[PDB]
C-alpha cells in the first residue's frame, strides 16, 4: 500500500515516477536517476556527492570525524545491482514504517507538510521557494518542475552518518520559522550499528552475549522524525545544545548533543530539557504559526502556477490546522496547536517507534555504538515488513534473537570501524599512564542546562489559569482523530530555471575538542582497574592472571577480583585427563564468584563492585559493603550533583470585595495552583536526577558488565593455552568446544547482571529519594506554610462576604495544606524498571523515615542521610555484643545530640509525625524515684516542642505548643507484679501524632493511650534532639535505648506492627530481658507454663533426673517493688558444637550442647533416646561420661513456616533425627524434664504457650536481685 509500484533500477525513465532529475545546487550539476515512490517523496539511489561541494572524495578525511563509529567504502553503491537493492531496501523500510500505527501517521504528516510559499518580496503575493523543488527531465528532453517534501539519497563519505539536510535562504530560517523546506535524508539500508545491552537480562534471561543490531527501520524513522520537524519549520536551533563540563579527568573530552536531537529520541532523553525551555519553544513556534496565518491573510494574489489562491490557502490551512472563519481570515487556535506540536515533538519519537516495532534499541543516545555491520534486508528469509529481523516461528522470534549478531550472524557482516580505538582519548597517569577512549568517560552536564522560575512569586486571581503522559493509549486517541486521505495535490507550476541555485542550510561552526590531554592523579582510578582486567589480546601463553596492580605492567597484566583460591587454581599447571576437569570445576567457581550477593533500602549488595572498579572514592580495602552502608549511593558517584532548590516564590491572592463567588473561586485557584507547584518541583528534581545521577549509575552498570566479560575472556584464554599444549593425540580424545564453554559463562554473566542491575537500580532511586527529593520537599513545606497564613488571612478579611462557609473553607484549607502531596515517580518517568524499584522502595516505611539512627562500622550514623551531625558524649556506652544498644547514665557527658540539616527541616514537620524506639528501663529501686519525672529524649526550643520522659512505672510523651500549653499521653506499668512484661525488658515504643486529631502511644504494637492535640499548637520545630537523662535524681540510674526512628507521617496500626516484627531480629534468640542469647553464659530458667517453679536436679548421672519444684521466692523493697524471684534454680550454659559465627550469639537452627551447673560443676544435659515411649527423661551427666547418649540440641526461635515461638530447645539423637523439644512431663507425680516429640507436633498447629516454653535469665544490674 505505501509504495504502489515495485521499481527496478533498470526500469526506463518515463518523466512521471522514473526520471533523471535535477536538484538545488551550487553552480552546475548533472541530472541523476530518481524514482518517485510516493506522492511528494523521491529516492535517489546514488552516493551523495553533490549536496555538499566541500566534500569531493568519498575517502576517509585526513583528520577523523569525532564519532565513536565510522565507516568509509568509496566503492559502495557504485554499480547497478547495488542501486537496485538499495531501492528495494528503502522501499521495504517505508513499508515497515507505514505498517505501524505511529508510522502510518508520521508519513501522513510528512506528505501533508508542503513547504510554505514562501518567496514573494511582496507582502501581498504567494510564491514558491525554488529550493523546495526539483526539475524533472522528460523522455523528449524537456523539463517539468515539481514540488517535493522529501528525498532519500545515498550517503556521503561517512556511510553511516545519516542526516537531514535542507537548502537555505538569504534571510529566512525555513526549518525554524514555521515555513519548512524540502528535506534530503542521507541514508543506506545496507548498513546498521552495533550496540550492547545490559538491561533486558531482567525480563529475558536466556539472552545473547555480544552485540545487537539496530533495526534500520528505526534509523530511518529517526531521520523522518527530523524531516517532520523541519517540514513544519519547528526544528530547534542547532546552536541550542546540551553543554557538558569537560575539564575533569573523568569527563568526556567533548560531545555535541543538540536539543533537537534530544527531542527526537524522546523517551528518557527528551526529559533532560526542563519545563521552562520546553515552554519557551512551544511559544516560539506558536507565534511563528501566527505570522504564517497573518501572511496568508494579507495574501490577495498568487504567482507561478494555475492553482487558485484559495486552493493554496486551503492547503496551508490543513497543514498548520488553521481556523478559517466566514470572511476567509485565518487564525491559530492555541488548543489545536498545542496538540499538533505535541504530536510532532512528543509522539513522533524514536522511543515510541521502538515500542511499535517491538525491537531492542539503544535506550538513550548515551549508549554509544560499538560496531558497524553490513546487512541485507531485501530477502524475506532475512527481514520482513512485519518482524524485521526477529522472524516469527523461528529461533530468531524469541529474545530479540534476530538482532543478536552472534546468533543471527549469517545476516550481519562485521565491518571495520574507521575510528581508531584511541583515535580520541584522555591520558590518565599516577604520581604508568593509560590512553582512555573518549566515549568511555563520564557525561557531566553543566548546571547551565537546568533553569527554572521557581523563585518567581505569582499573583492569584479568580481568572487564574488551571491546567490541564504519553501512553500507547494516548497515541491511539491521536490516531483515531486522523484523516487518512485528501492527499495534498501534485499541481502544475511554472518552470524554474533549469539549474536551481541553492546552498545547504549553513550549520555551526563547531569545534574539534582538544585531544588528550594528560592528567597526573594521586589514586589509581577505575579506568586503570578496568584496563588491568584487559589483555593482550594475544598469543603465547602469558596470561598469568593475578590481583594487586601493577598487573598493568606485563602481561600478564591480568588483574582479577576474586581470590587466590581462584588466581591459584587457574595458574596451574594441569593436564590432561585432569583437563576436564578443572573445567567442570571452573564453571562452578565463576558462578559462585559472580552470583555472590550479601540496610533496608539497598537490599541486595554485590561486594566485588568495589574491588573490580575500586569504588570510587575508592580507598580501601575491599569491604565495599561497609562503606556503602556507612555512606549510601553517593560513594558510587564520580561527581556529586548539587541540589539547588531556591526559596520558592509565594502566592498573593487578589480580593474581590463583597463578592462571594470570585472570592471562593480564588481560593480554589490558590489550592490547585499549589498542587501544580509540587508537581513543578518534583519534575525539576527528577530531571536533575536523570541527567546527573542516573547516568553515572548506568555507566558503572555497563562497566561492570564489561568487567565480567573481561574476566570470562581471560579465563577462556588461559584454558586454551593449556588444552593446546596437548593432546594431540586425544586431543582427538576430549572433543571440547570453547563455543559451549562460552555458552556456559554467558548464562553465568547474565545471572550476575540480574543481581547487579537490581543493586544499581536501588542505588539510583535511593539517592533520588533520600538525597535529592527531601531538599525539594522542604521548600515546598515552607511554601505551604506561607500559603496557609495567606489563605486564612484571606478567609478572615472577607468573612463578611463568606457568611455561610467560613468553616467549610478553613477546614478545606487546613485539610489540604496539612498534607504533603505524595511523590509518584510514575508521574515523571516512563521506565518500568525504575518504577518497580521505587514501588518496592516505598513498600518499606523505614525508607521513608527522616531519622534512622544505627551503629555501623564504628559510629552511630543516620541512615536516612538527614542528620547534619551526631555528637556522642564521652561517657555513652555501646553494648560490646550489639552496638546498636546504647547505655546512657545519669552523668552529663552520657548524652547524644542529633542535629538535622538546616536545608532539610521545616517549621511544620512535627504536625503529623511519629517516632519509635526500643528501650530497657531498669527496675526502680529507690524512693526518690517515686516522684521524679525525668527527660530522656528532648526536642524543645524555648518551651515549645516535644519530649519523651519517664517516671515511676511510666513512659510519658509530651507536646508543648507554642509557648504553653501541654498535651500528654502515658503508659503505666506496675512493679507490684510477679513477672512483668515490662520491667527491665526491651520494649518497643511508638508515638504517633496528628495535629488535627490526637497523639497515640503504642507499646509492643498495642495502643495504650490517645488524647486530643487539636487544641494546639503550633509546635516550634527544633533543630536538636538530645538523648540524655535530664532531671533524674537517682544518681545510679541509666537507660538502654536503641533503633531510634523519626517519621514525617502518622503511622497506622498495621505499619506499627510490621515495624515491630521487622526490628525483632527474629533470626536470633533472646534471653528474658530481650538481649541476644549467648554462648558460655549462665542462665536461670523460667518455664512459662509453670512460672512459679524452677529447675533442680535430684541426682547427678543417668540415675538422677531434672525436675521443676516450687515455689520461687519473692523479692521486695518496701513501697517500691514486689516480684517473683528470678535468680533461682540450676543454671544452664549453652555450648558450641557446630558453628561458624566468629561470634557468641545463639542463632536460629544452631546445634548446641547444654551444660548444667550443680554446686559449681558443669554437667552435660543428655538422655537415653531408646527409652520406651514419647517422653525421654533428661539427666545431668558427667561431661566426659555422656557415652553415645543424646545431647545435641537445635536452638529454635521460629517454627518453620516462620511463626515465632518460645520453645527454644529441640533435642536430637546422634543420627540427625528429632527426639523432641525440651519441656516437662506431668500430671502424675513429679515434674521431670523430658524431651517429647509431642511438642514438635503442637508447635506446627498452634502458637500457644506449652510445657516447652522457656526463658533464659541472666544476671542483670537492672534487676538487682541478689543471688
Amino acid at each position, epitope marked *: 500500500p505505501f509504495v504502489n509500484k515495485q521499481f527496478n533500477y533498470k526500469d526506463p525513465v518515463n518523466g512521471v515516477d522514473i526520471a533523471y532529475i535535477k536538484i538545488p545546487n551550487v553552480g552546475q550539476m548533472q541530472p541523476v536517476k530518481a524514482f518517485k515512490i510516493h506522492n511528494k517523496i523521491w529516492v535517489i539511489p546514488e552516493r551523495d556527492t553533490f549536496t555538499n561541494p566541500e566534500e569531493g572524495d568519498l575517502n576517509p578525511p585526513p583528520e577523523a570525524k569525532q564519532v565513536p563509529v565510522s565507516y568509509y567504502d568509496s566503492t559502495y553503491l557504485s554499480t547497478d545491482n547495488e542501486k537496485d537493492n538499495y531501492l528495494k531496501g528503502v522501499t521495504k523500510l517505508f513499508e515497515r514504517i507505514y505498517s505501524t500505527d505511529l508510522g502510518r501517521m508520521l508519513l501522513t504528516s510528512i506528505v501533508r507538510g508542503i513547504p510554505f510559499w514562501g518567496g514573494s518580496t511582496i507582502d501581498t503575493e504567494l510564491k514558491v521557494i525554488d529550493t523546495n523543488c526539483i526539475n524533472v527531465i522528460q523522455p523528449d528532453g524537456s523539463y517539468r518542475s515539481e514540488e517535493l517534501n522529501l528525498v532519500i539519497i545515498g550517503p556521503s563519505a561517512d556511510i553511516i552518518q545519516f542526516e537531514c539536510k535542507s537548502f537555505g535562504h538569504e534571510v529566512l530560517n525555513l526549518t525554524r520559522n514555521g515555513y519548512g523546506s524540502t528535506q534530503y535524508i542521507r541514508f543506506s539500508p545496507d548498513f546498521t550499528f552495533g550496540f550492547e545491552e545490559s538491561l533486558e537480562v531482567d525480563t529475558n534471561p536466556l539472552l545473547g552475549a555480544g552485540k545487537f543490531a539496530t533495526d534500520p527501520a528505526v534509523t530511518l524513522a529517526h531521520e523522518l522524525i527530523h524531516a517532520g520537524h523541519r517540514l513544519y519549520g519547528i526544528a530547534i536551533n542547532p546552536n541550542r545544545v546540551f553543554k557538558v563540563n569537560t575539564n575533569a579527568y573523568y569527563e568526556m573530552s567533548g560531545l555535541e548533543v543538540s536539543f533537537e536531537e534530544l527531542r527526537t529520541f524522546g523517551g528518557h532523553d527528551a526529559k533532560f530539557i526542563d519545563s521552562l525551555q520546553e515552554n519557551e519553544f512551544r511559544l516560539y513556534y506558536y507565534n511563528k504559526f501566527k505570522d504564517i496565518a497573518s501572511t496568508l491573510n494579507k495574501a490577495k494574489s498568487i504567482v507561478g502556477t494555475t492553482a487558485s489562491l484559495q486552493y493554496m490557502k486551503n492547503v496551508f490551512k490543513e497543514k498548520y490546522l488553521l481556523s478559517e472563519d466566514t470572511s476567509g481570515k485565518f487564525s491559530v487556535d492555541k488548543l489545536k496547536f498545542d496538540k499538533l506540536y505535541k504530536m510532532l515533538t512528543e509522539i513522533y519519537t524514536e522511543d515510541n517507534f521502538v515500542k511499535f516495532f517491538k525491537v531492542l534499541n539503544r535506550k538513550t543516545y548515551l549508549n554509544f555504538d560499538k560496531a558497524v555491520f553490513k546487512i541485507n534486508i531485501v530477502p524475506k528469509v532475512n527481514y520482513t515488513i512485519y518482524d524485521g529481523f526477529n522472524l516469527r516461528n523461528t529461533n530468531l522470534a524469541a529474545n530479540f534473537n534476530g538482532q543478536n549478531t552472534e546468533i543471527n550472524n549469517m545476516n550481519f557482516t562485521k565491518l571495520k570501524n574507521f575510528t581508531g580505538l584511541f583515535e580520541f582519548y584522555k591520558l590518565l597517569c599516577v604520581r604508568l599512564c593509560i590512553k582512555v577512549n573518549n566515549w568511555d568517560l563520564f557525561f557531566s552536564p553543566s548546571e547551565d542546562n537546568f533553569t527554572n522560575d521557581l523563585n518567581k512569586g505569582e499573583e492569584i486571581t479568580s481568572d487564574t489559569n488551571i491546567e490541564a503522559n504519553i501512553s500507547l493509549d494516548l497515541i491511539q486517541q491521536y490516531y483515531l482523530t486522523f484523516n487518512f486521505d485528501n492527499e495534498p495535490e501534485n499541481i502544475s507550476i511554472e518552470n524554474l530555471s533549469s539549474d536551481i541555485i541553492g546552498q545547504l542550510e549553513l550549520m555551526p561552526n563547531i569545534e574539534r575538542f582538544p585531544n588528550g590531554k594528560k592528567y597526573e592523579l594521586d589514586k589509581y582510578t577505575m579506568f586503570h582497574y578496568l584496563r588491568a582486567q584487559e589483555f593482550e589480546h594475544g598469543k603465547s601463553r602469558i596470561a598469568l592472571t593475578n590481583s594487586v596492580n601493577e598487573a598493568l605492567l606485563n602481561p600478564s597484566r591480568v588483574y582479577t577480583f576474586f581470590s587466590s583460591d581462584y588466581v591459584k587454581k587457574v595458574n596451574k599447571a594441569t593436564e590432561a585427563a585432569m583437563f576436564l576437569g578443572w573445567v567442570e570445576q571452573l564453571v562452578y567457581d565463576f558462578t559462585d564468584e559472580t552470583s555472590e550477593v550479601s540496610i533496608a533500602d539497598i537490599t541486595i549488595i554485590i561486594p566485588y563492585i568495589g574491588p573490580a572498579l575500586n569504588i570510587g572514592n575508592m580507598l580501601y580495602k575491599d569491604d565495599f559493603v561497609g562503606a556503602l552502608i556507612f555512606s549510601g549511593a553517593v560513594i558510587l558517584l564520580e561527581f556529586i550533583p548539587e541540589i539547588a532548590i531556591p526559596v520558592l516564590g509565594t502566592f498573593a491572592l487578589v480580593s474581590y470585595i463583597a463578592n462571594k463567588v470570585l472570592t471562593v473561586q480564588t481560593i480554589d485557584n490558590a489550592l490547585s495552583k499549589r498542587n501544580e507547584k509540587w508537581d513543578e518541583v518534583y519534575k525539576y528534581i527528577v530531571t536533575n536526577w536523570l541527567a546527573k545521577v542516573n547516568t553515572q549509575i548506568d555507566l558503572i552498570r555497563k562497566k561492570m558488565k564489561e568487567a565480567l566479560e573481561n574476566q570470562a575472556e581471560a579465563t577462556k584464554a588461559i584454558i586454551n593455552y593449556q588444552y593446546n599444549q596437548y593432546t594431540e593425540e586425544e586431543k582427538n580424545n576430549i572433543n571440547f568446544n570453547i563455543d559451549d564453554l562460552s555458552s556456559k559463562l554467558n548464562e553465568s554473566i547474565n545471572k550476575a547482571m540480574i543481581n547487579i542491575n537490581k543493586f544499581l537500580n536501588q542505588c539510583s532511586v535511593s539517592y533520588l529519594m533520600n538525597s535529592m527529593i527531601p531538599y525539594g520537599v522542604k521548600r515546598l513545606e515552607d511554601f505551604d506554610a506561607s500559603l496557609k497564613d495567606a489563605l486564612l488571612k484571606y478567609i478572615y478579611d472577607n468573612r463578611g462576604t463568606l457568611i455561610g462557609q467560613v468553616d467549610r473553607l478553613k477546614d478545606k484549607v487546613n485539610n489540604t495544606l496539612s498534607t504533603d502531596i505524595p511523590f509518584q515517580l510514575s508521574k515523571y518517568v516512563d521506565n518500568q524498571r525504575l518504577l518497580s524499584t521505587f514501588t518496592e522502595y516505598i513498600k518499606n516505611i523505614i525508607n521513608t523515615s527522616i531519622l534512622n539512627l544505627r551503629y555501623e562500622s564504628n559510629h552511630l550514623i543516620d541512615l536516612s542521610r538527614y542528620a547534619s551531625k551526631i555528637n556522642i558524649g564521652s561517657k555513652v556506652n555501646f553494648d560490646p555484643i550489639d552496638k546498636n544498644q546504647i547505655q546512657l547514665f545519669n552523668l552529663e*557527658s552520657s548524652k547524644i545530640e542529633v542535629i538535622l540539616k538546616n536545608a532539610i527541616v521545616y517549621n511544620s514537620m512535627y504536625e503529623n509525625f511519629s517516632t519509635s524506639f526500643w528501650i530497657r528501663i531498669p527496675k526502680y529501686f529507690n524512693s526518690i524515684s517515686l516522684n521524679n519525672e525525668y527527660t530522656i529524649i528532648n526536642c524543645m526550643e524555648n518551651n515549645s516542642g516535644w519530649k519523651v520522659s519517664l517516671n515511676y512505672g511510666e513512659i510519658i510523651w509530651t507536646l508543648q505548643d507554642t509557648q504553653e500549653i501541654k498535651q500528654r499521653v502515658v503508659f503505666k506499668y506496675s512493679q507490684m507484679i510477679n513477672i512483668s512484661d515490662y520491667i527491665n525488658r526491651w520494649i518497643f515504643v511508638t508515638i504517633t501524632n496528628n495535629r488535627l486529631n490526637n497523639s497515640k502511644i503504642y507499646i509492643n504494637g498495642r495502643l495504650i493511650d490517645q488524647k486530643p492535640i487539636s487544641n494546639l499548637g503550633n509546635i516550634h520545630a527544633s533543630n536538636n534532639i538530645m538523648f540524655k537523662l535530664d532531671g533524674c535524681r537517682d*544518681t*545510679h540510674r541509666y537507660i538502654w535505648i536503641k533503633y531510634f526512628n523519626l517519621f514525617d507521617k502518622e503511622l497506622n496500626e498495621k505499619e506499627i506492627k510490621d515495624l515491630y516484627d521487622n526490628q525483632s531480629n527474629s533470626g536470633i534468640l533472646k534471653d528474658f530481658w530481650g538481649d541476644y542469647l549467648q554462648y558460655d553464659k549462665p542462665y536461670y530458667m523460667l518455664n512459662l507454663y509453670d512460672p512459679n517453679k524452677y529447675v533442680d536436679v535430684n541426682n547427678v548421672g543417668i540415675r538422677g533426673y531434672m525436675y521443676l519444684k516450687g515455689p520461687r521466692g519473692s523479692v521486695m523493697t518496701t513501697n517500691i517493688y514486689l516480684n517473683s524471684s528470678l535468680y533461682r534454680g540450676t543454671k544452664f550454659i549453652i555450648k558450641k558444637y557446630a558453628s561458624g559465627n566468629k561470634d557468641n550469639i545463639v542463632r536460629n537452627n544452631d546445634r548446641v550442647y547444654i551444660n548444667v551447673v550443680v554446686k559449681n560443676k558443669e554437667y552435660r544435659l543428655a538422655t537415653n533416646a531408646s527409652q520406651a515411649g514419647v517422653e525421654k527423661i533428661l539427666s545431668a551427666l558427667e561431661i566426659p561420661d555422656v557415652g553415645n547418649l543424646s545431647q545435641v540440641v537445635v536452638m529454635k526461635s521460629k517454627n518453620d513456616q516462620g511463626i515465632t515461638n518460645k520453645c527454644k530447645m529441640n533435642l536430637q539423637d546422634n543420627n540427625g533425627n528429632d527426639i523432641g523439644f525440651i519441656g516437662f512431663h506431668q500430671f502424675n507425680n513429679i515434674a521431670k524434664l523430658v524431651a517429647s516429640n509431642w511438642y514438635n507436633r503442637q508447635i506446627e498447629r498452634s502458637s500457644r504457650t506449652l510445657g516447652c516454653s522457656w526463658e533464659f535469665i541472666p544476671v*542483670d544490674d537492672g534487676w538487682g536481685e541478689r543471688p
Partner: antibody, heavy 117, light 112 residues
Framework: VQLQESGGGLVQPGGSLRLSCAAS????????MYWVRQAPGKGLEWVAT????????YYSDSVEGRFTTSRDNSKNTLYLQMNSLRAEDTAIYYC???????????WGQGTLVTVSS | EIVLTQSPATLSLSPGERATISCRAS??????????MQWYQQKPGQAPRLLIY???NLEPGIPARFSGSGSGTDFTLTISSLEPEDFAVYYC?????????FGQGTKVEIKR
C-alpha cells in the same frame, strides 16, 4: 592530683561567705563533686552534691534554700555560696570527688568556717 | 533520710586483735545489684580516708587487714589484725540515695 579549698574564716551570724575548691591533676569536668562538713570534734555531715555539667544539684535539708553550690569546669573550680549563716554552720568544710559509681575518693585538707559575733 | 546506726560507739583493743565495727541502715542501702555503703577512717587533723566502697570492695592503696561485708541493712567493717597506727574514728556512709548520710562514728582506741 589534689584539691585546695579556700574561703574559710570568721563571719557574723546572718552573714555570708563563698568557698572555692581548686582541683588539679585529673578530669574534673566529668566527675560529680560533693561538699562535706564536720563541726569541731563531731561527726561528718553531707552538705551538697553538684553534677559534672553543673546543671543538677542536691542539698542536705539542713542547708537547703540557703547554700548554693556551683562550678566552673573551665577553671577546674568548685564553689559553695553560703548565706544567712548560723552558729551551727561552724565546721571544717571538705570538697571531694565522687568516682562514678563507687565513692568519694579524693578529699582536700578542708577549710575552717567559724560563725560568731 | 536513711539513718545509719553504727556500733559499738567506742572500741578499745590490743594490737594484732580483731576489730569488728558494725553499721545498720534504717532503710535498705541496695540498688542496681549493689550496696552503696562506704567505710571511712579519720585521724585527728586529716580529711577522711576511703577504706571500702560498695560494701565489700577494698580501695586500692589500702592494706589487706581491712575487709568489708554485708548487704541490705547490715554491714560490717572488720580489721583482721590491728596496728597501733589504727586509733581512729571509723565512719560508715551510704550512697544509695539522697540525703547521703553518715554513721555517728566509732572510736577505735588501742590498748597497751
Amino acid at each position: 592530683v589534689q584539691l585546695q579549698e579556700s574561703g574559710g574564716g570568721l563571719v557574723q551570724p546572718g552573714g555570708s561567705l563563698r568557698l572555692s575548691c581548686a582541683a588539679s591533676g585529673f578530669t574534673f569536668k566529668y566527675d560529680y563533686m560533693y561538699w562535706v562538713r564536720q563541726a569541731p570534734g563531731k561527726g561528718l555531715e553531707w552538705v551538697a552534691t553538684i553534677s559534672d555539667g553543673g546543671s543538677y544539684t542536691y542539698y542536705s535539708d539542713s542547708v537547703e534554700g540557703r547554700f548554693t553550690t556551683s562550678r566552673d569546669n573551665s577553671k577546674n573550680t568548685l564553689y559553695l555560696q553560703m548565706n544567712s549563716l548560723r552558729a551551727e554552720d561552724t565546721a571544717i568544710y571538705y570538697c571531694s570527688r565522687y568516682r562514678y559509681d563507687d565513692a568519694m575518693d579524693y578529699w582536700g585538707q578542708g577549710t575552717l568556717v567559724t560563725v560568731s559575733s | 533520710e536513711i539513718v545509719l546506726t553504727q556500733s559499738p560507739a567506742t572500741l578499745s583493743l590490743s594490737p594484732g586483735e580483731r576489730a569488728t565495727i558494725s553499721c545498720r541502715a534504717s532503710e535498705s542501702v541496695d540498688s542496681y545489684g549493689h550496696s552503696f555503703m562506704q567505710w571511712y577512717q579519720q585521724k585527728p587533723g586529716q580529711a577522711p580516708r576511703l577504706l571500702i566502697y560498695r560494701a565489700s570492695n577494698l580501695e586500692p592503696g589500702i592494706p589487706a587487714r581491712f575487709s568489708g561485708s554485708g548487704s541490705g541493712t547490715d554491714f560490717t567493717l572488720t580489721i583482721s589484725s590491728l596496728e597501733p597506727e589504727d586509733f581512729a574514728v571509723y565512719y560508715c556512709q551510704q550512697g544509695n540515695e539522697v540525703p547521703f548520710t553518715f554513721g555517728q562514728g566509732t572510736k577505735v582506741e588501742i590498748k597497751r
